[PDB]
Amino acid sequence: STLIPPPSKKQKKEAQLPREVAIIPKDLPNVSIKFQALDTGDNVGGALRVPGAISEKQLEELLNQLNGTSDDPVPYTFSCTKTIDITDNLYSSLIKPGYNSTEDQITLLYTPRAVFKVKPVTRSSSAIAGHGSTILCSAFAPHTSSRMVTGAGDNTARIWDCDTQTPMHTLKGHYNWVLCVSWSPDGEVIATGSMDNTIRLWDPKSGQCLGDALRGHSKWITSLSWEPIHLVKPGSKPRLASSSKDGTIKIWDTVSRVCQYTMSGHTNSVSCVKWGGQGLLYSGSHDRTVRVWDINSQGRCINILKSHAHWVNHLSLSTDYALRIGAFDHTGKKPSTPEEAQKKALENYEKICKKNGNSEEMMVTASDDYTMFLWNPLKSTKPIARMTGHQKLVNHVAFSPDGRYIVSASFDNSIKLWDGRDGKFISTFRGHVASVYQVAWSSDCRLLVSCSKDTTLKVWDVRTRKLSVDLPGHKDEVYTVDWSVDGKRVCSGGKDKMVRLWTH
Amino acid sequence: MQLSWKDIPTVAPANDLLDIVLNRTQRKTPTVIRPGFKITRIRAFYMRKVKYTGEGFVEKFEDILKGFPNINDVHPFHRDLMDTLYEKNHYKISLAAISRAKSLVEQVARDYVRLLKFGQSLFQCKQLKRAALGRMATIVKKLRDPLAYL
Amino acid sequence: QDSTIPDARVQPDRRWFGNTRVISQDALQHFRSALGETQKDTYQVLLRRNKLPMSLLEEKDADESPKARILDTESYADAFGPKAQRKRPRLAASNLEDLVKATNEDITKYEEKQVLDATLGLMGNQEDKENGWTSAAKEAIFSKGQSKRIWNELYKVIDSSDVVIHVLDARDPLGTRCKSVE
Amino acid sequence: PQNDYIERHIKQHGKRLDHEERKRKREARESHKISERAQKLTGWKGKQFAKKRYAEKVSMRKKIKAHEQSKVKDALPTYLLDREQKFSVPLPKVRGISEEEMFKVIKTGKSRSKSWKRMITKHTFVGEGFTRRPVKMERIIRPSALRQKKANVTHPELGVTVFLPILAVKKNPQSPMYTQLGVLTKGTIIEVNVSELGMVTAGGKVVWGKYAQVTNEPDRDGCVNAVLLV
Amino acid sequence: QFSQLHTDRKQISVGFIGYPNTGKSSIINTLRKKKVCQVAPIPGETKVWQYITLMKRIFLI
RNA sequence: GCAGUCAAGCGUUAUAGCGACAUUGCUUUUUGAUUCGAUGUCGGCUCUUCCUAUCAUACCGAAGCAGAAUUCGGUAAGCGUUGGAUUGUUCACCCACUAAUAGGGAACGGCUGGGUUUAGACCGUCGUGAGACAGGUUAGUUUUACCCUACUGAU
Ligand SMILES: Nc1nc2c(ncn2[C@@H]2O[C@H](COP(=O)(O)OP(=O)(O)OP(=O)(O)O)[C@@H](O)[C@H]2O)c(=O)[nH]1
Ligand SMILES: [K+]
Ligand SMILES: [Mg+2]
Ligand SMILES: [Mg+2]
Ligand SMILES: [Mg+2]
């Protein structure tokens, strides 16, 4: 093992020299500060003088009192513009470095955060067998973190109980490899798209198959998306959008088990399909284009975005977390009525959608031309931003659940973190020695997990922009990774025919 | 300006170019060497083979590269017309592939002449010469599509 | 110069199949951070270089990505020829006003570059060939110091030297510097 | 003339009056011509003709087989499809190389009477921080043209070959003296840098150094080929 | 100082390089305090390498 | 070259083992950008002949070969294939003329410079020394023919 250089004699003497104690001066004068919103660019209170020994919690309570929401506060994070966050207290954050003096003003950018915290996953719960071939896809249930669906190369899917780390149900309807799996946002049905050009629906509680397989695609299924709950009218079940290698996107009504629309604008294989929150569908394909279709207009393509020079491998929406979660939250509570479920899903979606004046649904496309494009398809047709810097193809891209960050995992053994609104470059996550396949955020947008070709998972802290923990244990390549809604478990699967569960 | 580019020599395909250059080496250089001769004579024989083959490949590549117009340097009307007709990206990529192949052939020739300085027997010198010619041939075989396009 | 033929064998052993060098993630992070904080002094010389995985350590953020490899999507045969399937430009112009603005700009830049090269090259090399005038052959004395024999001697002395002294003329020290050798 | 003027001329005036008949008779004569060439061409041209005939017959048989076959009628993820690529050593015993073949006698002196200097005729790895001994005290000579720094290493698993830097020489099978001199011959165990192979231990350590065995003669073919011992 | 830094090498060599007629031979003669290297105003007087022993552990080339 | 793939065959009744033609990876990545140790034999002058693996000249075949020019190839050795610069090296490289400035053998299994150059001398490295060399510089007598044969002419 290669070791770091040892300390020298002079360094040992310096260490044995007495240390300095970071103490708060009692004669610390007041500092003039001005608040400013990161999202809206609005100032509250103007120039206000605050003591030098003010804590972050006391500053948070003061800001809540200024806003007038002392009864129901919402925790905020503060930064000062280099832009440096407020870790513990103002003196140790800004005055102790000496960049800003006491006489100067402090412009504090405040940003809302999550009430709860997710602990990082530090160890492997169990290595569960049962799949006869390599694992191809996996997902967690939206309502609970005790249910995981996993589709593999033995023509089967499996429902695993994550509480006991034991198999629960076997789903053996398909004929070829189960390429993709998905859970309904209301948690009622699992949809699996296979290599035999078929789609199947499964009741998870009984481990059973609903009717016959969905047929009509002439090539294998590439991606499955569900209609959002906040757009689904109460008393009806959400529809299922499916893409495939043949270049067509089919829409399925599961209530009547029919196909309603068959969009066919792409000249090449469709990489992915996403059902957005404003009644639109976004499709990415190997013809270097992105097609925006309107569901409400008989599946007519609203727009064609052409700015990439290669296959668009993936695309992501700002509200993807809310779209996948529906009405459920991290507490796992279930609404009593379908009307209540639709209303709560609408509120959860609007929390990300409508902010700083006008509601927007940003899209990001990661392509094989080593780049990404950031679009706002509702307002403009030109791309809002171009993200460059990856030296190889960008395989995965993910918006943070709050929509304030973008993460791109590339084949150059690297991950990149970009700003979510303007698309400017923030940081690079390094530590993988093989190509990164896919990535997954945590619920509070503070932790990230990535799986790589080097048989490892890595958990990164987004705030400090460093590697939090390294998780080995897979004997071969890892293909799928997912993080639960409540932030308690992480599932991983790959060539070793084993499902690895990770917890704190 | 130039206004006309009919004076470009014929571009042979990869296998035909290989046959032309290798058979030129075989015809135009002496071919009899004996194991009973001095080791300096043997080394000079195989050095001449390697150097002559490299020069032949390089001169064919240079004839290709000098004849074709510079798409960026010509008048904008000619540049737009040739971009419409021939896809400027493919045009420049093919010519750059020719240039890279020329540099690689030169490098192989220099390296193997230097290695042949230390040959100790006819068998070793013959193996080194065959290795140099085979590496050049692999470089040339990697240009099949750009040569046909050009 | 012994002529006996040795018995060259490699015995079976499990030491051949184990990892010989490994590095931890913490050590990789430490060396990645240290590469960048180094402040080289002119009066410090390198006595012994530490053995490190420099391929894993030499990671630098880059603002721009390399160009997309167009041959993967479109081949030469589909680009041009009897079997060509390209019928439209890859990137069409936005509109005719932008097209004519771009062409006028290109005409202006071409004329500026033609004037800039007509200042020197056309009044130099091109005009001489019309009258049949050729420059005299370059003298062989001016290539002294560039022979393969001399440069072989130079590489010999460098390979034999622990300390190399580069001697400069105080009258023209930048003129007498061997930057390529350095 | 401009554009496709020969085709326009053919469209406007036709061809020569006997063009079709002449072409038909030449194509009928082609079989006799091929047989006469096969029986008449001598030397290198004849050998090349026979080789090309064999290749053409093989290609024709493959085309017939493919047509008849057509007339009769790894579990990768979605983002990876539509994309392409005992403790015994593989060479337990290699050819013995004597010192007479390994070393060349270098004579010194004005009358060439001293013969104490020796030159290694094989490819070597000298390592980092190498400086030549002073010429008066330099007995063993390893010329710079024969020094190697990298090798083409083939991985048995995953079936790839990578150009890797050489770290050390572990065991030359001929002799420990050749091992310490750094001689790269067939069957030599070397140490290679495998950082770009992305190997991780079961404990999370990044592997960047392993063993490989040289499987060719770099003195003969001018390069070092090795098999990684996994 | 360089010799002391390489005290484990048993000897060090210092090679003089540069443009023709810059004075490498003159500098070596200055260090030896004796005309051991031939010197001329015409460029190219020195044609091959030459070893000079300055001290027991220091050679000049 | 190494490692692998395929399969016309060969082998077999144990889908063991060989294996032509093809083909992949490394060497070597896309926008025509920008000298690294020959350890023991070399070059001239004069002059003849031979080979063809043909550079030019003769005649042909093919090619988007319009014309002009050029490229590849076939028969072909009848006939030609140059003048110079450069030794702080040239196991070559430039300038020009030219129809063209093709390759090679009969040595490398007479004058003449490099070279086996012995005695004089100096510098450098090594050796306690006699001396030797990692080396560098300079100066240094070998002198048939009228014999036989061959060849050229003459009785
Ligand atoms: N004025 C002055 N002249 C110097 C000095 N050093 C060298 N010279 C002169 O410069 C000329 C070059 O001397 P060299 O010692 O032969 O220089 P070099 O670099 O060894 O040149 P080459 O051996 O030919 O490559 C000599 O005539 C010296 O007299 C100096 O320090 N001052
Ligand atoms: K001088
Ligand atoms: Mg000098
Ligand atoms: Mg002939
Ligand atoms: Mg003498």
PDB file of N, CA and C in Angstrom, chain C residues 1-23 25 28 49 51-53 55-56 156 159-162, chain D residues 87-89 92-94 96-100 103 105 118 128 131-132 147 167 170-171 173-174 187 189 191 195 201 205-211 229-230:
ATOM      1  N   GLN C   1      30.858 -14.596 -21.449  1.00  0.00           N
ATOM      2  CA  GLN C   1      30.790 -15.222 -22.764  1.00  0.00           C
ATOM      3  C   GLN C   1      30.625 -16.734 -22.654  1.00  0.00           C
ATOM      4  N   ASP C   2      30.030 -17.208 -21.564  1.00  0.00           N
ATOM      5  CA  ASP C   2      29.808 -18.636 -21.393  1.00  0.00           C
ATOM      6  C   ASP C   2      28.756 -19.137 -22.374  1.00  0.00           C
ATOM      7  N   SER C   3      29.026 -20.292 -22.978  1.00  0.00           N
ATOM      8  CA  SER C   3      28.178 -20.842 -24.026  1.00  0.00           C
ATOM      9  C   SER C   3      27.157 -21.854 -23.521  1.00  0.00           C
ATOM     10  N   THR C   4      27.146 -22.160 -22.225  1.00  0.00           N
ATOM     11  CA  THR C   4      26.192 -23.128 -21.697  1.00  0.00           C
ATOM     12  C   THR C   4      24.770 -22.585 -21.776  1.00  0.00           C
ATOM     13  N   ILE C   5      23.840 -23.451 -22.159  1.00  0.00           N
ATOM     14  CA  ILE C   5      22.435 -23.087 -22.297  1.00  0.00           C
ATOM     15  C   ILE C   5      21.765 -23.268 -20.939  1.00  0.00           C
ATOM     16  N   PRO C   6      21.248 -22.209 -20.322  1.00  0.00           N
ATOM     17  CA  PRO C   6      20.589 -22.358 -19.022  1.00  0.00           C
ATOM     18  C   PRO C   6      19.208 -22.983 -19.150  1.00  0.00           C
ATOM     19  N   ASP C   7      18.741 -23.532 -18.033  1.00  0.00           N
ATOM     20  CA  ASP C   7      17.402 -24.108 -17.937  1.00  0.00           C
ATOM     21  C   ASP C   7      16.460 -23.020 -17.437  1.00  0.00           C
ATOM     22  N   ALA C   8      15.791 -22.344 -18.369  1.00  0.00           N
ATOM     23  CA  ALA C   8      14.984 -21.165 -18.062  1.00  0.00           C
ATOM     24  C   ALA C   8      13.564 -21.601 -17.723  1.00  0.00           C
ATOM     25  N   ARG C   9      13.248 -21.635 -16.430  1.00  0.00           N
ATOM     26  CA  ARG C   9      11.929 -22.026 -15.959  1.00  0.00           C
ATOM     27  C   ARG C   9      11.401 -21.002 -14.968  1.00  0.00           C
ATOM     28  N   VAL C  10      10.081 -20.861 -14.945  1.00  0.00           N
ATOM     29  CA  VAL C  10       9.377 -20.063 -13.949  1.00  0.00           C
ATOM     30  C   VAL C  10       8.523 -21.021 -13.131  1.00  0.00           C
ATOM     31  N   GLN C  11       8.765 -21.065 -11.827  1.00  0.00           N
ATOM     32  CA  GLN C  11       8.036 -22.007 -10.995  1.00  0.00           C
ATOM     33  C   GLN C  11       6.620 -21.504 -10.721  1.00  0.00           C
ATOM     34  N   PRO C  12       5.669 -22.415 -10.525  1.00  0.00           N
ATOM     35  CA  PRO C  12       4.333 -21.995 -10.090  1.00  0.00           C
ATOM     36  C   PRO C  12       4.385 -21.390  -8.696  1.00  0.00           C
ATOM     37  N   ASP C  13       3.633 -20.309  -8.510  1.00  0.00           N
ATOM     38  CA  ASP C  13       3.647 -19.569  -7.259  1.00  0.00           C
ATOM     39  C   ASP C  13       2.436 -18.649  -7.242  1.00  0.00           C
ATOM     40  N   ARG C  14       1.816 -18.514  -6.072  1.00  0.00           N
ATOM     41  CA  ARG C  14       0.670 -17.626  -5.948  1.00  0.00           C
ATOM     42  C   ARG C  14       1.070 -16.171  -5.741  1.00  0.00           C
ATOM     43  N   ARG C  15       2.364 -15.885  -5.587  1.00  0.00           N
ATOM     44  CA  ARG C  15       2.804 -14.499  -5.495  1.00  0.00           C
ATOM     45  C   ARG C  15       2.695 -13.774  -6.829  1.00  0.00           C
ATOM     46  N   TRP C  16       2.623 -14.507  -7.946  1.00  0.00           N
ATOM     47  CA  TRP C  16       2.529 -13.850  -9.244  1.00  0.00           C
ATOM     48  C   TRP C  16       1.151 -13.248  -9.478  1.00  0.00           C
ATOM     49  N   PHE C  17       0.113 -13.812  -8.866  1.00  0.00           N
ATOM     50  CA  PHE C  17      -1.262 -13.435  -9.163  1.00  0.00           C
ATOM     51  C   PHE C  17      -1.858 -12.465  -8.153  1.00  0.00           C
ATOM     52  N   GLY C  18      -1.087 -12.021  -7.168  1.00  0.00           N
ATOM     53  CA  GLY C  18      -1.577 -11.038  -6.231  1.00  0.00           C
ATOM     54  C   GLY C  18      -1.285  -9.616  -6.669  1.00  0.00           C
ATOM     55  N   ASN C  19      -2.024  -8.676  -6.091  1.00  0.00           N
ATOM     56  CA  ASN C  19      -1.761  -7.268  -6.346  1.00  0.00           C
ATOM     57  C   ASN C  19      -0.434  -6.867  -5.717  1.00  0.00           C
ATOM     58  N   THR C  20       0.370  -6.122  -6.469  1.00  0.00           N
ATOM     59  CA  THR C  20       1.667  -5.680  -5.972  1.00  0.00           C
ATOM     60  C   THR C  20       1.631  -4.274  -5.395  1.00  0.00           C
ATOM     61  N   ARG C  21       0.832  -3.375  -5.965  1.00  0.00           N
ATOM     62  CA  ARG C  21       0.717  -2.009  -5.471  1.00  0.00           C
ATOM     63  C   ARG C  21      -0.749  -1.618  -5.397  1.00  0.00           C
ATOM     64  N   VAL C  22      -1.157  -1.063  -4.254  1.00  0.00           N
ATOM     65  CA  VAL C  22      -2.505  -0.549  -4.060  1.00  0.00           C
ATOM     66  C   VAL C  22      -2.409   0.818  -3.395  1.00  0.00           C
ATOM     67  N   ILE C  23      -3.462   1.611  -3.566  1.00  0.00           N
ATOM     68  CA  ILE C  23      -3.552   2.935  -2.959  1.00  0.00           C
ATOM     69  C   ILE C  23      -4.972   3.143  -2.450  1.00  0.00           C
ATOM     70  N   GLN C  25      -8.328   5.336  -1.044  1.00  0.00           N
ATOM     71  CA  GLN C  25      -9.033   6.532  -1.492  1.00  0.00           C
ATOM     72  C   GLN C  25      -8.560   7.764  -0.733  1.00  0.00           C
ATOM     73  N   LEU C  28      -5.259   8.738  -2.239  1.00  0.00           N
ATOM     74  CA  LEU C  28      -5.514   9.369  -3.531  1.00  0.00           C
ATOM     75  C   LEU C  28      -5.980  10.807  -3.357  1.00  0.00           C
ATOM     76  N   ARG C  49      12.244  10.940  -7.271  1.00  0.00           N
ATOM     77  CA  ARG C  49      10.817  11.109  -7.508  1.00  0.00           C
ATOM     78  C   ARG C  49      10.043   9.946  -6.899  1.00  0.00           C
ATOM     79  N   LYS C  51       7.156   7.220  -6.387  1.00  0.00           N
ATOM     80  CA  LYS C  51       6.368   6.403  -7.301  1.00  0.00           C
ATOM     81  C   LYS C  51       4.895   6.499  -6.918  1.00  0.00           C
ATOM     82  N   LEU C  52       4.089   7.068  -7.803  1.00  0.00           N
ATOM     83  CA  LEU C  52       2.676   7.315  -7.560  1.00  0.00           C
ATOM     84  C   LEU C  52       1.885   6.988  -8.816  1.00  0.00           C
ATOM     85  N   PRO C  53       0.591   6.662  -8.675  1.00  0.00           N
ATOM     86  CA  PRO C  53      -0.268   6.527  -9.860  1.00  0.00           C
ATOM     87  C   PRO C  53      -0.652   7.877 -10.452  1.00  0.00           C
ATOM     88  N   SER C  55      -1.451   8.691 -13.432  1.00  0.00           N
ATOM     89  CA  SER C  55      -2.627   8.694 -14.298  1.00  0.00           C
ATOM     90  C   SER C  55      -3.893   8.954 -13.490  1.00  0.00           C
ATOM     91  N   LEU C  56      -3.979   8.381 -12.289  1.00  0.00           N
ATOM     92  CA  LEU C  56      -5.104   8.645 -11.404  1.00  0.00           C
ATOM     93  C   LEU C  56      -4.990   9.984 -10.687  1.00  0.00           C
ATOM     94  N   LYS C 156      24.907  11.638 -25.489  1.00  0.00           N
ATOM     95  CA  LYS C 156      25.841  10.860 -24.681  1.00  0.00           C
ATOM     96  C   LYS C 156      26.238  11.606 -23.408  1.00  0.00           C
ATOM     97  N   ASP C 159      23.260  11.871 -21.021  1.00  0.00           N
ATOM     98  CA  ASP C 159      23.023  10.588 -20.371  1.00  0.00           C
ATOM     99  C   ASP C 159      24.085  10.282 -19.319  1.00  0.00           C
ATOM    100  N   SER C 160      25.301  10.797 -19.497  1.00  0.00           N
ATOM    101  CA  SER C 160      26.359  10.558 -18.524  1.00  0.00           C
ATOM    102  C   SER C 160      26.408  11.584 -17.395  1.00  0.00           C
ATOM    103  N   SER C 161      25.674  12.689 -17.492  1.00  0.00           N
ATOM    104  CA  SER C 161      25.791  13.788 -16.539  1.00  0.00           C
ATOM    105  C   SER C 161      24.757  13.693 -15.419  1.00  0.00           C
ATOM    106  N   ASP C 162      25.191  14.005 -14.194  1.00  0.00           N
ATOM    107  CA  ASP C 162      24.285  14.234 -13.073  1.00  0.00           C
ATOM    108  C   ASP C 162      23.893  15.704 -12.960  1.00  0.00           C
TER     109      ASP C 162
ATOM    110  N   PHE D  87      -1.400 -22.280  -9.873  1.00  0.00           N
ATOM    111  CA  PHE D  87      -0.692 -21.006  -9.908  1.00  0.00           C
ATOM    112  C   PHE D  87       0.424 -21.026 -10.946  1.00  0.00           C
ATOM    113  N   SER D  88       0.173 -21.671 -12.079  1.00  0.00           N
ATOM    114  CA  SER D  88       1.168 -21.802 -13.131  1.00  0.00           C
ATOM    115  C   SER D  88       1.094 -20.620 -14.089  1.00  0.00           C
ATOM    116  N   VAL D  89       2.261 -20.125 -14.489  1.00  0.00           N
ATOM    117  CA  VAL D  89       2.362 -19.019 -15.439  1.00  0.00           C
ATOM    118  C   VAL D  89       2.092 -19.553 -16.842  1.00  0.00           C
ATOM    119  N   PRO D  92       5.722 -21.596 -18.590  1.00  0.00           N
ATOM    120  CA  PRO D  92       6.613 -22.195 -17.581  1.00  0.00           C
ATOM    121  C   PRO D  92       8.040 -22.398 -18.060  1.00  0.00           C
ATOM    122  N   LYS D  93       8.246 -22.673 -19.346  1.00  0.00           N
ATOM    123  CA  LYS D  93       9.569 -22.974 -19.877  1.00  0.00           C
ATOM    124  C   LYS D  93       9.766 -22.237 -21.192  1.00  0.00           C
ATOM    125  N   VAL D  94      10.896 -21.545 -21.324  1.00  0.00           N
ATOM    126  CA  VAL D  94      11.252 -20.832 -22.541  1.00  0.00           C
ATOM    127  C   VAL D  94      12.642 -21.280 -22.982  1.00  0.00           C
ATOM    128  N   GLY D  96      16.500 -21.392 -23.577  1.00  0.00           N
ATOM    129  CA  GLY D  96      17.672 -20.917 -22.866  1.00  0.00           C
ATOM    130  C   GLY D  96      18.524 -20.018 -23.747  1.00  0.00           C
ATOM    131  N   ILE D  97      19.068 -18.968 -23.140  1.00  0.00           N
ATOM    132  CA  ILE D  97      19.914 -18.003 -23.834  1.00  0.00           C
ATOM    133  C   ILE D  97      21.252 -17.955 -23.115  1.00  0.00           C
ATOM    134  N   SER D  98      22.321 -18.290 -23.830  1.00  0.00           N
ATOM    135  CA  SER D  98      23.644 -18.299 -23.231  1.00  0.00           C
ATOM    136  C   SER D  98      24.204 -16.882 -23.135  1.00  0.00           C
ATOM    137  N   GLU D  99      25.254 -16.740 -22.320  1.00  0.00           N
ATOM    138  CA  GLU D  99      25.918 -15.448 -22.172  1.00  0.00           C
ATOM    139  C   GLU D  99      26.552 -14.991 -23.478  1.00  0.00           C
ATOM    140  N   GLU D 100      27.004 -15.936 -24.307  1.00  0.00           N
ATOM    141  CA  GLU D 100      27.592 -15.586 -25.596  1.00  0.00           C
ATOM    142  C   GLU D 100      26.574 -14.902 -26.497  1.00  0.00           C
ATOM    143  N   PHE D 103      25.557 -11.244 -24.592  1.00  0.00           N
ATOM    144  CA  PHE D 103      26.528 -10.161 -24.544  1.00  0.00           C
ATOM    145  C   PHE D 103      27.377 -10.127 -25.809  1.00  0.00           C
ATOM    146  N   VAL D 105      31.118  -8.572 -27.250  1.00  0.00           N
ATOM    147  CA  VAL D 105      32.416  -8.085 -26.791  1.00  0.00           C
ATOM    148  C   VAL D 105      32.739  -6.774 -27.495  1.00  0.00           C
ATOM    149  N   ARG D 118      31.383  -5.181 -22.332  1.00  0.00           N
ATOM    150  CA  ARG D 118      30.343  -6.058 -22.852  1.00  0.00           C
ATOM    151  C   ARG D 118      29.079  -5.252 -23.111  1.00  0.00           C
ATOM    152  N   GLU D 128      13.801   4.267 -13.238  1.00  0.00           N
ATOM    153  CA  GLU D 128      13.782   5.710 -13.050  1.00  0.00           C
ATOM    154  C   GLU D 128      15.101   6.194 -12.464  1.00  0.00           C
ATOM    155  N   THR D 131      21.367   7.016 -14.710  1.00  0.00           N
ATOM    156  CA  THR D 131      22.469   7.790 -15.256  1.00  0.00           C
ATOM    157  C   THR D 131      23.561   6.824 -15.688  1.00  0.00           C
ATOM    158  N   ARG D 132      24.174   7.105 -16.833  1.00  0.00           N
ATOM    159  CA  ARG D 132      25.227   6.246 -17.351  1.00  0.00           C
ATOM    160  C   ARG D 132      26.471   6.337 -16.477  1.00  0.00           C
ATOM    161  N   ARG D 147      16.427   0.362 -24.714  1.00  0.00           N
ATOM    162  CA  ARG D 147      15.743   0.520 -23.438  1.00  0.00           C
ATOM    163  C   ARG D 147      14.244   0.684 -23.658  1.00  0.00           C
ATOM    164  N   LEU D 167       6.904  -0.901 -14.510  1.00  0.00           N
ATOM    165  CA  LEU D 167       7.349  -0.475 -13.189  1.00  0.00           C
ATOM    166  C   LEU D 167       8.657  -1.124 -12.757  1.00  0.00           C
ATOM    167  N   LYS D 170      10.746  -8.352 -12.320  1.00  0.00           N
ATOM    168  CA  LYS D 170      10.652  -9.208 -11.144  1.00  0.00           C
ATOM    169  C   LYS D 170      11.540 -10.444 -11.253  1.00  0.00           C
ATOM    170  N   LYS D 171      11.412 -11.205 -12.336  1.00  0.00           N
ATOM    171  CA  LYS D 171      12.196 -12.427 -12.492  1.00  0.00           C
ATOM    172  C   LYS D 171      12.431 -12.681 -13.974  1.00  0.00           C
ATOM    173  N   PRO D 173      13.703 -15.410 -16.339  1.00  0.00           N
ATOM    174  CA  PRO D 173      13.872 -16.857 -16.122  1.00  0.00           C
ATOM    175  C   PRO D 173      15.259 -17.381 -16.451  1.00  0.00           C
ATOM    176  N   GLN D 174      16.058 -16.647 -17.229  1.00  0.00           N
ATOM    177  CA  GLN D 174      17.387 -17.131 -17.582  1.00  0.00           C
ATOM    178  C   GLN D 174      18.329 -17.104 -16.382  1.00  0.00           C
ATOM    179  N   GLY D 187       9.243 -14.788 -21.487  1.00  0.00           N
ATOM    180  CA  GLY D 187       9.029 -15.421 -20.206  1.00  0.00           C
ATOM    181  C   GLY D 187       9.425 -14.597 -19.001  1.00  0.00           C
ATOM    182  N   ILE D 189       9.078 -12.089 -16.019  1.00  0.00           N
ATOM    183  CA  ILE D 189       8.011 -11.551 -15.184  1.00  0.00           C
ATOM    184  C   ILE D 189       8.324 -10.089 -14.892  1.00  0.00           C
ATOM    185  N   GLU D 191       6.570  -6.060 -13.728  1.00  0.00           N
ATOM    186  CA  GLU D 191       5.521  -5.381 -12.982  1.00  0.00           C
ATOM    187  C   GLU D 191       5.009  -4.207 -13.806  1.00  0.00           C
ATOM    188  N   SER D 195      -3.380   1.223 -13.608  1.00  0.00           N
ATOM    189  CA  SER D 195      -4.271   2.251 -13.077  1.00  0.00           C
ATOM    190  C   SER D 195      -5.475   2.475 -13.981  1.00  0.00           C
ATOM    191  N   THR D 201      -9.824  -3.775  -5.025  1.00  0.00           N
ATOM    192  CA  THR D 201      -9.795  -4.943  -4.159  1.00  0.00           C
ATOM    193  C   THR D 201     -11.166  -5.164  -3.521  1.00  0.00           C
ATOM    194  N   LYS D 205      -9.504  -0.895  -1.990  1.00  0.00           N
ATOM    195  CA  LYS D 205      -8.246  -0.304  -2.422  1.00  0.00           C
ATOM    196  C   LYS D 205      -8.141  -0.319  -3.941  1.00  0.00           C
ATOM    197  N   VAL D 206      -7.677   0.791  -4.504  1.00  0.00           N
ATOM    198  CA  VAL D 206      -7.460   0.884  -5.944  1.00  0.00           C
ATOM    199  C   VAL D 206      -6.141   0.200  -6.283  1.00  0.00           C
ATOM    200  N   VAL D 207      -6.197  -0.783  -7.174  1.00  0.00           N
ATOM    201  CA  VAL D 207      -5.011  -1.492  -7.640  1.00  0.00           C
ATOM    202  C   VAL D 207      -4.392  -0.703  -8.783  1.00  0.00           C
ATOM    203  N   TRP D 208      -3.089  -0.430  -8.685  1.00  0.00           N
ATOM    204  CA  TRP D 208      -2.370   0.237  -9.762  1.00  0.00           C
ATOM    205  C   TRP D 208      -1.064  -0.463 -10.119  1.00  0.00           C
ATOM    206  N   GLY D 209      -0.833  -1.669  -9.613  1.00  0.00           N
ATOM    207  CA  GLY D 209       0.365  -2.410  -9.953  1.00  0.00           C
ATOM    208  C   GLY D 209       0.163  -3.907  -9.871  1.00  0.00           C
ATOM    209  N   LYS D 210       0.525  -4.630 -10.929  1.00  0.00           N
ATOM    210  CA  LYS D 210       0.383  -6.083 -10.941  1.00  0.00           C
ATOM    211  C   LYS D 210       1.532  -6.701 -11.725  1.00  0.00           C
ATOM    212  N   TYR D 211       1.497  -8.022 -11.863  1.00  0.00           N
ATOM    213  CA  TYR D 211       2.522  -8.760 -12.585  1.00  0.00           C
ATOM    214  C   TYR D 211       2.022  -9.184 -13.961  1.00  0.00           C
ATOM    215  N   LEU D 229      -1.103 -11.314 -15.325  1.00  0.00           N
ATOM    216  CA  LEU D 229      -1.332 -12.507 -14.513  1.00  0.00           C
ATOM    217  C   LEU D 229      -2.458 -12.215 -13.530  1.00  0.00           C
ATOM    218  N   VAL D 230      -3.683 -12.516 -13.943  1.00  0.00           N
ATOM    219  CA  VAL D 230      -4.842 -12.348 -13.077  1.00  0.00           C
ATOM    220  C   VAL D 230      -5.315 -13.706 -12.576  1.00  0.00           C
TER     221      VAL D 230
END
